[PDB]
Amino acid sequence: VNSFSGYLKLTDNVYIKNADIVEEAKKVKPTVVVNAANVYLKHGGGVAGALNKATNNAMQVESDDYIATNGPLKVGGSCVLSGHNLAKHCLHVVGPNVNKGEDIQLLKSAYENFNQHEVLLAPLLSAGIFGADPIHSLRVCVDTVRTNVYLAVFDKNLYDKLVSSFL
Ligand SMILES: OC[C@@H]1CC2(CCCC2)CN1c1ncnc2[nH]ccc12
């Protein structure tokens, strides 16, 4: 039993809500919040910019030190950093940017990172500026993640569309 509230159950292990992941994190303070990152951990907009703003830029400061030491992430890859005031940990996950010609097959690799954590609060990956089909991303999530994932989807029209569709 956990403290997530108002989620619609999609499968044994996947749940979804029309919500801002930032607000869900502040309310729930989960063990792991997932960031929809880029390989440089430059948190400008969308999920990443919003999470970073909520940490008063501490996420960006920590991320810049990570990159200076380790170099960029791989598309499809991830790293675990602090969750700051939002969660214990933040799992920064890079989905493919379809608008940059990156292989959509890497979306499955991106979601595989979630399986290293028993419970996660997460966004849908590769949407927004990355330009992947959100219905496809949800199907990949459901067909790839085996651990317990709570998906917070910002756009009301997007949420209504996703929960009224057969995956
Ligand atoms: O789940 C992925 C969705 C998809 C969006 C890009 C196009 C429509 C919206 C951004 N995003 C978010 N989801 C949950 N919390 C969020 N907080 C700030 C952004 C955000």
| Domains of the chain, residue spans | 8-163
Distance CA 139, CA 150 (A): 14
- Is there a contact between 162 and 134 (Cβ–Cβ < 8 Å)? yes
Query: For residue 129, which atom of ligand 1 is closest to its CA?
Result: 6
Q: Are 137 and 107 in contact (CB under 8 A)?
A: yes
The answer to whether the CB of 124 is under 6 A from ligand 1 is yes
Q: Is the dihedral of CA 140, 143, 146, 150 positive or negative?
A: positive
Q: Which residue has the tokens 């990956």?
A: 125
Residues 6 or more apart whose Cβ sits within 8 Å of residue 141: 14, 111, 114, 124, 125, 149, 151
Residue 119 is which amino acid? Answer: V
Looking at domain 8-163, its CATH architecture is 3-Layer(aba) Sandwich (3.40)
Centre of ligand 1 from the C-alpha of residue 160, in Å: 14
For 15, 60, 103, 113, the CA distances from 92, given in Å and listed in that order, are 20, 12, 19, 9
Identity (one letter) of the amino acid at 60? Answer: Q
Rounded CA separation 45/51 (Å): 9
Q: Point out the ligand 1 atom lying closest to the alpha carbon of residue 153.
A: 1
Give me the resolution in angstroms, 1 decimal.
1.0
Sequence-distant (6+) residues with CB within 8 A of 134 are 124, 127, 158, 161, 162
Please state, in angstroms and rounded to a whole number, the distance separating the CA atoms of residues 22 and 45: 13
Strands 148-153 and 14-18, sheet pairing: parallel
Give 22 Cα–ligand 1 centroid separation in angstroms.
10
Any ligand 1 atom below 6 A from CB of 33: no
Residue with the smallest CA separation from ligand 1 atom 18 is 47
Can you give the C-alpha Rg of the chain in angstroms?
Answer: 15
State both tokens at 153: 């989807």
**Both tokens assigned to 148:** 């317990």
With the C-alpha atoms ordered 120, 123, 126, 129, is the resulting torsion angle positive or negative? Answer: negative
Distance 61 CA to ligand 1 centre (A): 22
Nearest to 37 by CA among 21, 23, 24: 21
Write the CB contacts of 159 (distance below 8 Å, at least 6 apart in sequence).
Answer: 16, 17, 18, 153
Lookup: tokens for 36: 């929809």
User: Residue length, the chain?
Assistant: 167
Nearest of 30, 158, 146 to residue 83 by alpha carbon: 30
CA distances in angstroms from 116 to 80, 101, 106, listed in the order given: 11, 28, 17
Task: Please tell me the experimental approach by which this structure was elucidated.
Answer: X-ray
Nearest to 93 by CA among 118, 115, 62: 115
Nearest residue to 86 via CA among 42, 7, 17, 30: 30
Measured in Å, residue 65 CA sits from the centre of ligand 1 at 26
